[PDB]
Amino acid sequence: AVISMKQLLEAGVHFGHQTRRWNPKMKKYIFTERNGIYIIDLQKTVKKVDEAYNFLKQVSEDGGQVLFVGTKKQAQESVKSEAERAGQFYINQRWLGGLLTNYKTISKRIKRISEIEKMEEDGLFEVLPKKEVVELKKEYDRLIKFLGGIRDMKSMPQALFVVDPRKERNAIAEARKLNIPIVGIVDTNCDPDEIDYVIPANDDAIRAVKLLTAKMADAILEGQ
RNA sequence: CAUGGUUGUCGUCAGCUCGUGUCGUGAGAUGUUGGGUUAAGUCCCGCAACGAGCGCAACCCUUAAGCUUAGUUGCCAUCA
């Protein structure tokens, strides 16, 4: 559950953002400033972390899944790797506006993937007009790009893991509309009230994203 | 100038809309905007939009060249 402090300042977790870009609601979680950068208090960080850790093992033991998001490029592979580690579902590309609120139309497109995998094996990708061969292939690749990691999600996820709340604000709006708890990693200049389980950690360092989402992946691993 | 049916017209112009979702107290908006491109909301990239339908293509006829079948009532090369 707890992460050693040195594992954080080695991962750049203490790093925040410039004083220029600062949300004054982070003043509770900020510990002084270095080189004009608001250094996050690692103690507070760890504390908050080991509390979304117990909530997440609760979700995995109940049977719920966590929708990993983090379309940000620095979080892209970190989200993908640790979600499949836990058998959860991840988002790595453009968050489809209304994939949770408008699941009615998204459900057909999600099942379109498994449907598109079907015509290949039932033989109508073998008999096809020349342009339709690539046309239906193009429809596949678009869908794999977005609904690649959530193709097995059937209903609304019982939990959602946001890497950067400010970046993927479109996902948080859907979650709050359907009462979906969010575990989020806030660096600075982010709203700590738009999410419920707050991780005060750096959001740009490549290893910092990996280290915290792995512990959150460890949370599910100790629940299933 | 009660109408069915049929027709011109803008104009073969490329637009016209819908479902679910989202924003807006509301009329309304989005998608149908932006970066390019096309004869074409034609197509791509992105984007609170995700998908559709009537539209535009294509599909259908004729034409332009070729190959099989066919030899009359078509044709006339090898020959009289």
From TrEMBL:
GO BP, sorted A to Z: translation
Nucleotidyltransferase keyword on record: no
Keywords: Ribonucleoprotein, Ribosomal protein
GO cellular component: cytosolic small ribosomal subunit
Keyword Protein transport: no
GO MF entries: structural constituent of ribosome
Family: Belongs to the universal ribosomal protein uS2 family.
Protein name as catalogued: Small ribosomal subunit protein uS2
Gene: rpsB
